[PDB]
């Protein structure tokens, strides 16, 4: 039994392991929604507008998830300021603040998100009010300091209130620009949704079959108003590709206003009057593209804003697919 | 060709390697692994957002680091063991110091500047690292200062993966233009370019003296290419294997070529005689990755089935 000093390494491994087990219990419950497109000059922008108009967004609950990020930003800023105070040898305008500074390092164990008693707030307001701290801060151009330092410190009252809801500028500054996950985690019927807006079209399949598989749902955006036949052939090839045999295809027929005008003035024969025959014909041309599977369960919706018959439909489709896939692996069928 | 050259020598025969350890704790697909230079530690990457480094001798997890973004496709271990480099759909290579920096994380560098996904990376030393990206470029970065200091352009399609020469002075890359390009690290340019696959090239590795390499492709063939002769030397393809190849590695002598197939198996080929010498089974899904220790003592296999197996 060569357990000597080692039965501490073992102890560490089992402690990390309990943690690994706990993260796993939380995970796997996420509903992943993928926004795709961008294979053109502006497709994913149309997708974003479709999300804004028909899928709402920016609720209080999603804003609440940014509290810790705001706090973390605040903390690195205040630590940078404190250390620079120590570095330049600047003394307090009132020697009693030297006790506050000792308290500051002690009270900086209060980094318990959202514990914003009046005492902590007053400690931060008093440190920030000190003349040596202001003196160092206004010379920040001589060292490295986040530009948002003053922005946050002058608005600490609003941000630290427990009902704080981040604004659009707060979110935009949280470094979620470019690409850029494009994320929200709104709550509905006690389900936590995660929606991801990516692109890639006509040929980016190799990267997202390579990473997107086993995902809960695909949101497939189609420009309804869309050598034209080679493009149609390429679309046939991607949509109907054998590597996508076991993936449910959900269709958001988007830009319906433009599609309705275009089919009004530009005949459908370019690709292959009133809406019903042309729409039925498009459905027939698309559904004939499968040719290899018994069914796909496509959920087609005709939509107005988020205050109409749309949210029920999306949550109904997520629920029926999860149920049918739970029965698929219980011996039943 | 080597195949028509080695026909006379005796075959290797019964290659019976056994699983000596099963490492448990990942809860999703493994996308990458890399042997440490001690032939004992290894790193694995999973969609649970964790990169775990294991001590393979005792069956202990040394660290499990939770990653901020889970969409990883590549990772790398510095040969010093001092750093890892983890990529993502964020187009950023994050560097983590495993030995001198005490404890857990803070990130010292996020290598930003690629405009497509980071597809591959390999350290040179604790200084310099070579990386590939979906933006169709490759780049050498100075991690300390954070700038792309060298840039390797000339591929015309997404770059898939990369392999460092044994002296780390040269590297070769393989891309979805179905080509591989040899680049000079310090000169920052392509010496030679090899085309011929009709497929994306998914995999690449080196003969131990750095004078030849093997490719693995979705076109169901593997091929051996020689640098100095500047051409393909051999193709490896059963007629009834039409699926992709995911991974290649040499044994210590270079004699064994291990390859993972979409058909759920890892065939072990005699690299000198082109016969399959052995099989790595025990998985419920595609073998997606594999690797041989620098000392040759063991092989690790990683799989879409969420398991790794250790063989010797």
């Amino acid at each position, epitope marked *: 039994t060569l357990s*000597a*000093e080692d039965k501490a390494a073992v*102890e*560490r491994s089992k402690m990390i392991d309990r943690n690994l087990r706990e993260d796993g219990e939380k995970a796997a419950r996420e509903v992943k929604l993928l926004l795709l497109g961008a294979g053109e000059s502006g497709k994913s922008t149309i997708v974003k507008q479709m999300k804004i108009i028909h899928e709402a967004g920016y609720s209080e609950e999603e804003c609440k998830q940014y509290k810790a990020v705001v706090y973390s930003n605040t903390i690195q800023s205040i630590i940078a300021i404190i250390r620079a105070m120590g570095r330049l040898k600047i003394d307090f305008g009132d020697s009693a603040r030297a006790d506050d500074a000792r308290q500051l390092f002690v009270l900086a164990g209060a980094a318990e998100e959202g514990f914003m008693t009046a005492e902590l707030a007053g400690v931060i307001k008093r440190l920030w009010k000190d003349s040596g701290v202001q003196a160092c801060f206004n010379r920040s151009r001589e060292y490295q300091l986040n530009d948002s330092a003053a922005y946050y410190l002058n608005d600490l009252d609003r941000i630290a209130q427990p009902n704080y809801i981040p604004t659009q500028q707060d979110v935009l500054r949280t470094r979620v620009k470019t690409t850029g996950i494009v994320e929200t985690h709104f709550t509905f019927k006690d389900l936590h949704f995660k929606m991801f807006d990516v692109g890639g079209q006509r040929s980016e399949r190799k990267k997202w079959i390579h990473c997107f598989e086993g995902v809960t749902a695909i949101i497939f955006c189609v420009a309804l108003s869309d050598r034209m036949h080679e493009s149609m052939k390429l679309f046939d090839s991607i949509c109907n590709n054998k590597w996508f045999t076991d993936t449910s295809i959900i269709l958001f027929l988007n830009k319906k206003d433009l599609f309705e005008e275009k089919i009004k003035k530009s005949p459908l024969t370019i690709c292959y009057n009133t809406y019903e025959e042309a729409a039925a014909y498009i459905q027939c041309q698309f559904e004939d593209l499968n040719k290899r599977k018994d069914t796909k369960e496509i959920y087609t919706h005709f939509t107005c804003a988020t205050d109409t018959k749309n949210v029920q439909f999306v949550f109904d489709a997520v629920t029926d697919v999860i149920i049918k896939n739970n029965l698929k692996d219980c011996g039943l069928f | 060709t080597l195949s028509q050259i080695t026909n006379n020598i005796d075959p290797v025969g019964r290659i019976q390697m056994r699983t000596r350890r099963t490492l448990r704790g990942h809860l999703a697909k493994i996308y990458a692994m890399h042997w440490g230079t001690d032939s004992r530690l290894l790193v694995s990457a999973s969609q649970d957002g964790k990169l775990i480094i294991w001590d393979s001798y005792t069956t*202990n997890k*040394v660290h499990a680091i939770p990653l901020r973004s889970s969409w990883v496709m590549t990772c790398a271990y510095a040969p010093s063991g001092n750093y890892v480099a983890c990529g993502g759909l964020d187009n950023i290579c994050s560097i983590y110091n495993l030995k001198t920096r*005490e*404890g857990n994380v803070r990130v010292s560098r996020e290598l930003a500047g690629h405009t497509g996904y980071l597809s591959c990376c390999r350290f040179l030393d604790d200084n310099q690292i070579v990386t590939s990206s979906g933006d169709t470029t490759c780049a050498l970065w100075d991690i300390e200062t954070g700038q792309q200091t060298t840039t390797f352009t000339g591929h015309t399609g997404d770059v898939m993966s990369l392999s460092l020469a044994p002296d780390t002075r040269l590297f070769v890359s393989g891309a979805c233009d179905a080509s591989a390009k040899l680049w000079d690290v310090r000169e920052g340019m392509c010496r030679q370019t090899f085309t011929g696959h009709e497929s994306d090239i998914n995999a690449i590795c080196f003969f131990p003296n750095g004078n030849a390499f093997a490719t693995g492709s979705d076109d169901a063939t593997c091929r051996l290419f020689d640098l100095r002769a500047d051409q393909e030397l051999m193709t490896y393809s059963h007629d009834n294997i039409i699926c992709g190849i995911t991974s290649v590695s040499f044994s210590k002598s270079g004699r064994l070529l291990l390859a993972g197939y979409d058909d759920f198996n890892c065939n072990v080929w005699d690299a000198l005689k082109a016969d399959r010498a052995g099989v790595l089974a025990g998985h419920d899904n595609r073998v997606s990755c594999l690797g041989v220790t620098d000392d040759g003592m063991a092989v690790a296999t990683g799989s879409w089935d969420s398991f790794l197996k250790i063989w010797n």
Partner: single-chain antibody
Amino acid sequence: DVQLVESGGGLVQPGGSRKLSCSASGFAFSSFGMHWVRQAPEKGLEWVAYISSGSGTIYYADTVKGRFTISRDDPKNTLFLQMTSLRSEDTAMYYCVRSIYYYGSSPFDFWGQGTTLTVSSGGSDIVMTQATSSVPVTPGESVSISCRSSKSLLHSNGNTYLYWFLQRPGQSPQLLIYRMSNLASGVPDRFSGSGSGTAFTLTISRLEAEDVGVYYCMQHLEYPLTFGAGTKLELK
């Protein structure tokens, strides 16, 4: 920046009780094992107690079991020591020591400043022997101190569990060699260690001014942890 600040020390009558504290900062406190080591007034270091990370493993010195309680408050990054039945033989300087254990780790790599406890008036362990209690040296010269154990410190796993520490006069001890051959961080390359099985040697080349102090070897093969009596290097 790693800090360990002990407090709670002082003079106590025999038979009394006392809680020591050790305050940790700048590291993942709950990830480290912790030890207590004490040093009698004119004597060497003697290991007192160990609590693993997570408190799953606890070891006591024989002279203290039943009387002493070791504890930790990991969420508050605080260490406690509950003392009872204090004897005169408990009078010592007490160091709290952090020790992380994993493949390649360096145990005993950070020491607090130490707190002094003074108490008023009223076998199976491997023995390590440094037969030479002091040695006069001159700067620039090279010295070799030796130590031996009554049992082999080389384990069946292949490692030889021998550590060298330096306590300069008036300061906390400083790690010199871990696991027989690993140089501690910050230690100059003029130090080197060698030996075999049961006899070991630490050699300094071109001995400098700062090199003066007491050198202890220590085994970490098994508990209780035990120190050598110490060898002092005096200037000529």
